[PDB]
Design a protein around this ligand. Structure first.
Ligand SMILES: [Mg+2]
Ligand SMILES: [Mg+2]
Ligand SMILES: [Mg+2]
Ligand SMILES: [Mg+2]
Ligand SMILES: [Mg+2]
Lengths: 197, 141, 110, 117
RNA sequence: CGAGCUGGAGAUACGCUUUGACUCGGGGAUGUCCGAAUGGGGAAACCCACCUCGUAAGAGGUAUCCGCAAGGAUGGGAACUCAGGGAACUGAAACAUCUCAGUACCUGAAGGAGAAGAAAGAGAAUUCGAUUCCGUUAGUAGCGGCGAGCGAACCCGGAUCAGCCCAAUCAAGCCGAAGUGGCUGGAAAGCUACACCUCAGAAGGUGAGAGUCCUGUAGGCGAACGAGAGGUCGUUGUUCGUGAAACGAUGACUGAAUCCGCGCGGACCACCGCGCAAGGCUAAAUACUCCCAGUGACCGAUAGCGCAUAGUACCGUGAGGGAAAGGUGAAAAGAACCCCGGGAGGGGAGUGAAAGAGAACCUGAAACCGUGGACUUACAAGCAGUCAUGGCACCUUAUGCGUGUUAUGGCGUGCCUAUUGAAGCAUGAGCCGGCGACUUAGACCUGACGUGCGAGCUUAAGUUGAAAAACGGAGGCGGAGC
RNA sequence: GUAGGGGAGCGUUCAGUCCGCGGAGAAGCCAUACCGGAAGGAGUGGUGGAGCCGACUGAAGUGCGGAUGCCGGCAUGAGU
C-alpha cells in the first residue's frame, strides 16, 4: 500500500509475501543469480596430457632410486595440474515460483522500510542530471544512500552518472540482487508495479 | 560514524540444513582412505555382474508393450466436478493430460450421480455404474 | 615495459611554449620548453636544474667536474598559461592562417 | 582459482620450531626432526603429571620415617599410630613437620606410641 | 597529423623537418639467391648452358599436365570437412565373437566451411512432404559368446528455411564540460574548507589514492578514397554380430520391364498403401579455430604457454627432445673529487625522501657458514627428551611470575609404512624451502537435509532482452495394478 | 581406542556486500612470559615500503614429513 509520489497517489494495491520477507529464500535467490553470472574460465593444463613433454624417461629399474613416467605429471614441477579446473557453467534453473516470490519478497523488504514510487518526472527537463540531482534533494535523496531507479523512459535515466547515489535500470527488467543491492528503491514506473496476469 | 557492519545483502544468511560442507579425505591427522588395500585409483569392481544370481536365473518370458491406457478413476468424475464435460478434451484441464495413449475408465470413486463420459475405453462395472445413476459411457465407433 | 603510452605520445604543448610546473617540486616555477619528448613524456624546461658530473675518462684532458644541466620531467607541468596560473585549453578557431587552429582558456590567447 | 600454501606453512612450522629450545642440535633447528621429537615429547609430558604425584609422595614417605626412626619408630608403625588416633590426620605436610619442626614431630611420634601399646 | 624526427639500444658524429618531416591510413614502384621451383645439374640458397632484345652493362624466355585459344593445374595451411586404407593396449576379472573403432595413425581432395540436399523417402494418419543442426522421444524398439556390453527412428518442440535445371556500417583521425586555498609529505590526485561539471564518476597515467592536471570517456564530427534395375556366390552398412532377416552397397557370374508399367512398405503371398530409381547444380542454419577485440569468484613467475620469450642454449648421426632466467629510483640525479689495492673490493664526500635503494640494485623466510656475549662442559655409557630441585644470569605482554641457561635426581626402546607382532639388524628418508594426491561431468540412478509450490510439480532447445531476465509445455515425474 | 560411520569447528585464496585502515607508513619478514578447548588469535617492538584487517555469504588448484616423490639451495664424507 505505498503512496505514489508523482502525478497521483493510489498505493494500497499489491498483496505482499508472508510472513515478512525471508532471507533464506532471498538467499536461495541472489545466489542462483550470481551462479548464472559466474562465467567459466579455467586456465589449467589439468591434463598430464595437455602439457608439453615426452613420454618415456629413464629406467624402470637399476638407475638407483626413481621410477618415473614422463616429466609431465601431478608430481613434477612443470608437469600437469592433477584435479585442476576446466571451463564449465555453474548455471542452474531456479524454480520459477521462487524467482517470483523473489523480488516480490524483496519489494516488501523495501516497502516495510524505505520504499518509493513516482509517476513521471517532468521534474527533470533534458538530461542535465544537475536538476536530476536537484529533484533528489527535495525528494529526500540527500546523497547518502544507494538508490536504484527502475523505470523505462529513455530520457529520464539519461540522468544518473553520479556515483554512490543511484543506479539506473530499464523496462522494469529489475532484479532481486540490485534492489537488495542498493538502499532505497525508486520503483518508479507503476508499470511492473500494479497489474499482472 | 560509530561502528556497525550493517544488516541486509550481507545479513542474508543461508537456511540451516540448506547446504553442508563437502568432504576432503583427511579427518584428523590419520586419513588414508578406502579399504586398507585391494582397492583404489581405478574403477571396475562395479556393483552388478552376470554370475551373481543375475545369470543362473531362468527366463525368456517375452516383451510386448502393446497399449497403455489412461486410467481415469471414477472419483475423478463423481464426488466433485460438476460435469465440467468429459468429451475428449476438457478432461485435460480437468486433469488427465496423458496424450499419446488411449483413455480407459475405471470404477474406483463412489458417490452416485448422473454424468455422461466419453472415455476411449471403459470397464464392465465401469459403465455399469455410470448410467446406473445417470450418464452415458461413449466409446468410439 | 609499456612506457609513456598511458597518455598518448601527445605533448599537450610545444618545445617553445612557457609552462608552470604544477605538482611535484618546482611547483609554479615557469620556463620556456626546450625538449618535447612525446613518446617518453619528457619535457626540458629551463625551470628545474641539476649539477651532474661528466664521466669523461680519457676524454682529451679530462678536467671533468660537475655540470649544471636541466633534468627532464613528465606531465608534472601544465602546458601553457596566461592567467599566470595553470589553465586547461578549449576555445580554438583559426587565424589569417585558417591553415591552423589555436587554443585558449577562460581567456583566449597562447 | 589457484591457492598456494604460502605463509600458511612457514608459520605452522615456526610454531613447533620455536617450542624446541635447548633441544640438542637438529632437534632444535630442523622442522621434521624437532617436530618428531615433540611426539615422544607428548608421551613424557602427559604421563609425567599422573606421575610426579607418584614421585612426590615418595619424597614425603622417605623423610617421614628418617625422623620416625629418629626416635625409635618407623613410618610403617608411626603412620598406623596417628591413624589409631583418628584425632591425628595430617599425613600431608607431616614430612615437613618432621623436617622443620623437630619439637613438633617428636610430639606426634610419642603421641602414636601412646595410642599404640 | 601538426614538431618533432634521427628503429629495439639505451652512444657519438652527420643530419633531416611547413615549399610540414615523423608517425598512422590507402594504393604504386623496387624486390639478389633458395624454396612447388619449373633452362639443365644439384648433397637448398650453389655450378653450368642456350636462344632472343642489346651500349655493352643489362633485359627476357627456356618444367611437366589439360586445352585452337584465353586460361586452368602443380605448393603451403593450426584445427574443422569428405574420401581411399585402418590398428592394438584395453574390456569381457583368462580368451578366439564381440569390446576398445572404424577411434589412433597413413594417404587423397577441398573450402571458409564442408558434407547433405529437392523422394523409386519416412510412417500407419489413406499423415508428413528437400538437406543439415539443437531438444525430445529413449537408454524406449532392438542388437548381444542374448555375456561384456552396444543402441535407433517416427511423432513433437526449435535454428533455418529456395528449389531449379537436363536426356528422350567497419579502419586513420578531429572536437569534446568541470577547482582553488590552506595542511601533512621528499612528492599529494590524501586531509580540510568552500566551488564546479555530469546524454561523458569506463579506464590508464601524473614523485601516495585522479569526475573537474594529462590521456581519454558520453556525445558530435569525420576523407581523397578503402572495405563489406532383379538375382546367385562372397561380404558389408543401419539397433542388424546370420539369425525366419528386409532394404541399402558392391567384387564375381548373370540379366528385366515400361501402365490394363516399375520399387518398396523387414522372409513369403494377396489384398491395402507410400513413391516414380539408373543426369545434374543449389543458398541458409552446422564445424573448427593460425589471426583479431572484449571479457573472466583464471594464473601472476617451481603459477601461467615450453618461452615475461627461446623452440634459443643445451642433448641426439637423425626422426627428435628441450631449459632457467623478472623487480635501482618518482626521476639517473647512476656516485665528480679523495683513502688502501695492479685489480676486484671497499671507506669517505656528493645526489636522493631513502644508498637502514648502487647497479652481482623491491621484500629477503629456512637449511647452511661465521664473529662477539651469557650460562656451561675434560670418572663419562648417552633417541637425546620429560618431570623435580638447586646454581648463575636477566627481568618491555616480565621482578612477582617468570624468561634463558645449567647441575643432579627420577623416568624414558626415533617417525612413518607394513604387520599376528617394530627401538627394531624390516621399508622409506642428508637438511631446508617451495611444488605435490579422492576431483570434474553428465536434463544419469539412489538416499539425508533444506526451499517452492502441492494432488499436482516442472521445463529442454530456442526467443527476445541483458551494466538485468522474462518468454518458451515438445517433453518428463505423481496419478492402477496384475 | 586401529579400519569405519556421525558431530562442531580452525585456516588459505578468490568473489559479492558491510565497517573501515594505511607514506607520522599496508602486505610480507623477524622477536615475545598474552588469549582461546584445539585447529588457531591478539597486543607490543623491529624490518619493510605499498597496498590491506575484521564480519556475513558464495566458489575452491584449500592445509602436508614421509611417496628410493619433483625443482632449487645448502650440508656430511673433509680439506680427505
Ligand atoms: Mg605448465
Ligand atoms: Mg618472487
Ligand atoms: Mg615466446
Ligand atoms: Mg620388503
Ligand atoms: Mg620431504
Amino acid at each position: 500500500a505505498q503512496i505514489n509520489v508523482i502525478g497521483q497517489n493510489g498505493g494500497r494495491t499489491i498483496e505482499l509475501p508472508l510472513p515478512e520477507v525471508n532471507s533464506g529464500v532471498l538467499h536461495e535467490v541472489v545466489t542462483w543469480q550470481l551462479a548464472s553470472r559466474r562465467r567459466g574460465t579455467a586456465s589449467t593444463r589439468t591434463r598430464a596430457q595437455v602439457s608439453k613433454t615426452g613420454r618415456k624417461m629413464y629406467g624402470q629399474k637399476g638407475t638407483g632410486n626413481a621410477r618415473h613416467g614422463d616429466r609431465s605429471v601431478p608430481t613434477f614441477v612443470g608437469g600437469g595440474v592433477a584435479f585442476g579446473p576446466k571451463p564449465r557453467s555453474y548455471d542452474y534453473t531456479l524454480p520459477r515460483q521462487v524467482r517470483q516470490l523473489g523480488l516480490a519478497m524483496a519489494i516488501a523488504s523495501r516497502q516495510e522500510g524505505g520504499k518509493l514510487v513516482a509517476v513521471d518526472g517532468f521534474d527533470i527537463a533534458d538530461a542535465k542530471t544537475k536538476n536530476f540531482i536537484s529533484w533528489a534533494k527535495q525528494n529526500g535523496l540527500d546523497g547518502t544512500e544507494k538508490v536504484l531507479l527502475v523505470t523505462d523512459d529513455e530520457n529520464t535515466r539519461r540522468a544518473a552518472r553520479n556515483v554512490s547515489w543511484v543506479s539506473v535500470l530499464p523496462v522494469a527488467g529489475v532484479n532481486v540482487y540490485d534492489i537488495l543491492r542498493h538502499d532505497r528503491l525508486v520503483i518508479d514506473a507503476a508499470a511492473l508495479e500494479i497489474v499482472e496476469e | 560514524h560509530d561502528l556497525k557492519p550493517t544488516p541486509g545483502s550481507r545479513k542474508d544468511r543461508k537456511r540451516v540444513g540448506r547446504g553442508p560442507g563437502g568432504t576432503d579425505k583427511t579427518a584428523g591427522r590419520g586419513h588414508k582412505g578406502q579399504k586398507s588395500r585391494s582397492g583404489a585409483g581405478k574403477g571396475a569392481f562395479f556393483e552388478g555382474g552376470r554370475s551373481r544370481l543375475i545369470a543362473r536365473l531362468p527366463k525368456r518370458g517375452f516383451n510386448n508393450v502393446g497399449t497403455t491406457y489412461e486410467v481415469v478413476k471414477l472419483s475423478q468424475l463423481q464426488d466433485l466436478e460438476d460435469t465440467t464435460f468429459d468429451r475428449d478434451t476438457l478432461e485435460a484441464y480437468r486433469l488427465v493430460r496423458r496424450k499419446n495413449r488411449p483413455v480407459k475408465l475405471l470404477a474406483s470413486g463412489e458417490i452416485s450421480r448422473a454424468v455422461t463420459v466419453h472415455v476411449d475405453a471403459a470397464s464392465a462395472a465401469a459403465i455399469k455404474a455410470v448410467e446406473a445413476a445417470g450418464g452415458r459411457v461413449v466409446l468410439p465407433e | 615495459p609499456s612506457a609513456g603510452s598511458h597518455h598518448n605520445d601527445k605533448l599537450h604543448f610545444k618545445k617553445g611554449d612557457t609552462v608552470i610546473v604544477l605538482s611535484g617540486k618546482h611547483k609554479g616555477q615557469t620556463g620556456k620548453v626546450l625538449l618535447a619528448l612525446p613518446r617518453d613524456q619528457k619535457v626540458v624546461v629551463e625551470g628545474v636544474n641539476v649539477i651532474t658530473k661528466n664521466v669523461k675518462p680519457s676524454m682529451t684532458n679530462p678536467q671533468g667536474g660537475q655540470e649544471q644541466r636541466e633534468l627532464a620531467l613528465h606531465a608534472s607541468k601544465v602546458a601553457l598559461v596566461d592567467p599566470e596560473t595553470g589553465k586547461a585549453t578549449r576555445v580554438r578557431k583559426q587565424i589569417v592562417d585558417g591553415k591552423k587552429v589555436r587554443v585558449a582558456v577562460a581567456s583566449g590567447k597562447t | 582459482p589457484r591457492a598456494k600454501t604460502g605463509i600458511v606453512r612457514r608459520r605452522r612450522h615456526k610454531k613447533v620450531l620455536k617450542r624446541a629450545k635447548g633441544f640438542w642440535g637438529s632437534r632444535s633447528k630442523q622442522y621434521r626432526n624437532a617436530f618428531q621429537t615433540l611426539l615422544n615429547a607428548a608421551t613424557y609430558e602427559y604421563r609425567d603429571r599422573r606421575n610426579k604425584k607418584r614421585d612426590f609422595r615418595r619424597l614425603w614417605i622417605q623423610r617421614i620415617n628418617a625422623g620416625a626412626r629418629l626416635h625409635g619408630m618407623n613410618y610403617s608403625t608411626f603412620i598406623n599410630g596417628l591413624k589409631r588416633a583418628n584425632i591425628d590426620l595430617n599425613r600431608k605436610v607431616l614430612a615437613d613437620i618432621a623436617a622443620r619442626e623437630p619439637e613438633a614431630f617428636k610430639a606426634l611420634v610419642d603421641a602414636s606410641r601412646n595410642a599404640r601399646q
